[PDB]
């Protein structure tokens, strides 16, 4: 019969109703800037995704951040450029300032507005109750905007959240894994980080949507209010689902599988077994009790669900009582 199809509960046909120019990143023509307007200062990070530098725009004496793109496929490089341009000006979205080409090696480079090289990961385990509520609401602003624009980030994690704690500003960065959502499309399940992969990626359900980012957001919230980094600490992709089942229980896992007629990998059967659902109060000890509240657990329980359709959307999450004090202070 095949697995049961699925569609997003919100922003389902936004890209279908858009002109083809919006989501046809392959046909996008890149307007190149002048690479000689920027002078690299120091390196900020490495890794097999890009080399991120801090530079100075000598034209206006403004600091900038330059991301050297790797010799990957041009198909994916145009996608990140098109997504950054469609989202330019959104709330808490990183702003693409310029795109230049290496005159010798023809290597592309993205230029962003300067951001304090302090990601959310070096700060989110040391926040107060109000700070967690505030910054979660700012991350929700970026998620609800890009979802309304037909784009899913597919890589929400603390390392991809730049924060300026002094001015209380937050920017969602690294859109290299972002992708346009079209109904019925079967996407690659090898996206996002291991500790933030949703159950739909672990059971290889390719017809997911914006709700993937809401699971990753729930993993960040659980990591903060419980002071446990990461909340799901599996040693591989298969064990990642086991650590999730040890908390959410296997009953809802197999019901989620039978609902969408998902063909589970036969190797999971030997490592899953039976696990009862553990209540969220059981993760509260004396070092995190001040960060946990009945509103936090209710909001968290509605984010970390197997069924991607049952999870709260970015818009529904903002209306939760967990953010009542933050919204009134705006």
């Amino acid at each position: 019969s095949g697995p049961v199809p699925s569609r997003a509960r919100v922003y389902t046909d936004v890209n279908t109703h858009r002109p083809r120019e919006y989501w046809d990143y392959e046909s996008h023509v890149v307007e190149w800037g002048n690479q000689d307007d920027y002078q690299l200062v120091r390196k900020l990070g490495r890794g097999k995704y890009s080399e991120v530098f801090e530079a100075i725009n000598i034209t206006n004496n403004e600091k900038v951040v330059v991301k050297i793109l790797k010799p990957v496929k041009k198909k994916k490089i145009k996608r990140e450029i098109k997504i950054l341009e469609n989202l330019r000006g959104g709330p808490n979205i990183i702003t693409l300032a310029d795109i230049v080409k290496d005159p010798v090696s023809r290597t592309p480079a993205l230029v962003f507005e300067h951001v304090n090289n302090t990601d959310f990961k070096q700060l989110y385990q040391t926040l107060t109750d109000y700070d967690i509520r505030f910054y979660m609401y700012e991350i929700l602003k970026a998620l609800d905007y890009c979802h309304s624009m037909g784009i899913m980030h597919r890589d929400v994690k603390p390392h991809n959240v730049m924060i300026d704690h002094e001015h209380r500003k937050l920017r969602l960065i690294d859109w290299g894994l972002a992708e346009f959502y079209h109904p019925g499309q079967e996407y690659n399940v090898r996206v996002a980080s291991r500790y933030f992969k949703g159950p739909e990626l672990l059971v290889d359900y390719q017809m997911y949507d914006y709700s993937l980012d809401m699971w990753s957001l729930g993993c960040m919230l659980a990591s903060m209010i419980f002071r446990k980094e990461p909340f799901f600490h599996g040693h591989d992709n298969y064990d990642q689902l086991v650590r999730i089942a040890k908390v959410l229980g296997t009953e809802d896992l197999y019901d989620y599988i039978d609902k969408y007629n998902i063909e589970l990998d036969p190797r999971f059967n030997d490592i899953l077994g039976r696990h009862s659902r553990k209540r969220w109060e059981r993760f509260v000890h004396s070092e995190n009790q001040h960060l946990v509240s009945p509103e936090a657990l209710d909001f968290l329980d509605k984010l970390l669900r197997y069924d991607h359709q049952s999870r709260l959307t970015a818009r529904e999450a903002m209306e939760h009582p967990y953010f009542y004090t933050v919204v009134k202070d705006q």
């Binding site: 000689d36 307007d37 002078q39 530098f53 230049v100």
Partner: peptide, 5 residues
Amino acid sequence: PAXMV
């Protein structure tokens, strides 16, 4: 030495 020398 690196876009500008």
